Amino acid sequence: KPPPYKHIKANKVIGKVQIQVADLSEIPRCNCKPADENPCGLESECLNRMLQYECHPQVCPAGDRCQNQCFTKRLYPDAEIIKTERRGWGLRTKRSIKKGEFVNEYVGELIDEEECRLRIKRAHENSVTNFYMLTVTKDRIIDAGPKGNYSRFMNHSCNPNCETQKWTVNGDVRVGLFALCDIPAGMELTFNYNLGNGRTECHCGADNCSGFLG
Ligand SMILES: C[S@@+](CC[C@H](N)C(=O)[O-])C[C@H]1O[C@@H](n2cnc3c(N)ncnc32)[C@H](O)[C@@H]1O
Ligand SMILES: [Zn+2]
Ligand SMILES: [Zn+2]
Ligand SMILES: [Zn+2]
Numbered sequence: 586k587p588p589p590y591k592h593i594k595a596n597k598v599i600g601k602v603q604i605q606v607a608d609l610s611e612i613p614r615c616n617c618k619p620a621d622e623n624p625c626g627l628e629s630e631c632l633n634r635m636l637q638y639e640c641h642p643q644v645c646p647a648g649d650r651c652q653n654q655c656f657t658k659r660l661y662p663d664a665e666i667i668k669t670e671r672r673g674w675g676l677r678t679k680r681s682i683k684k685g686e687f688v689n690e691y692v693g694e695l696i697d698e699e700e701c702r703l704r705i706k707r708a709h710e711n712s713v714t715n716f717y718m719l720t721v722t723k724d725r726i727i728d729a730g731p732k733g734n735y736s737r738f739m740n741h742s743c744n745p746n747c748e749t750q751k752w753t754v755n756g757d758v759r760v761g762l763f764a765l766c767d768i769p770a771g772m773e774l775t776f777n778y779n780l781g782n783g784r785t786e787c788h789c790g791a792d793n794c795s796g797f798l799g
Contacts, residue, residue: 587666587674591732593692594659596759602695602725607756612641615653619646625653627685639754655687656754656761662688664735667773671788673715675773676738682768688747689736691719691760693729701726705781720780721751721758736762741798742775744791749776 615633624647640653663679717730729737
């Protein structure tokens with residue numbers, strides 16, 4: 586292979602965008618216990634999980650047995666870039682992934698709406714057909730094109746195996762990819778994109794494919 590990009594670990598703010606960090610006092614504390622099985626885990630009633638808030642290890646009553654630290658720990662299932670025939674480069678998981686498990690964080694440059702329009706405009710002028718913009722809110726957009734991680738390679742599907750979720754982590758809203766089903770080793774990882782009047786024909790191959798991305 587793909588053209589170059591900078592492989593980065595965390596989002597990078599651009600221009601007027603600033604990252605909002607919580608004071609420790611502002612991070613919510615859940616009611617989970619060190620003596621629960623799988624504290625703050627997928628099965629649990631964790632109040633932080635419910636609201637898509639990541640626990641902070643200095644706040645959580647389960648301390649370091651807390652299973653709600655996925656963004657901060659940066660443990661992603663090992664993945665691999667693949668070449669497809671009609672959807673460019675994509676991404677496959679090397680190993681099996683369980684339903685609801687954290688797959689990756691969608692990282693990139695954090696830009697505002699005006700910057701995003703400017704990049705889309707420049708891209709169209711240079712006949713670029715690959716876009717990597719994901720809306721966090723109307724005026725906060727992650728562009729994983731110049732800089733990102735492997736999540737930038739996940740193609741669109743009309744019947745995806747992953748979905749995006751917006752999580753609050755230490756006071757900042759971040760975007761994670763999570764498995765919608767049990768995914769076997771070797772499967773291409775996809776999500777349903779959301780995303781001007783530009784449409785790209787879809788080659789996802791799903792039975793419910795609309796024909797366009799998204
Ligand atoms: C975020 S990138 C995904 C990785 C990209 N395939 C690459 O080669 O770098 C998004 C671009 O991939 C293409 N793409 C992704 N899913 C597709 C699909 N299902 N059908 C056709 N093109 C797709 C479109 O060009 C889209 O703008
Ligand atoms: Zn908890
Ligand atoms: Zn916790
Ligand atoms: Zn499709």
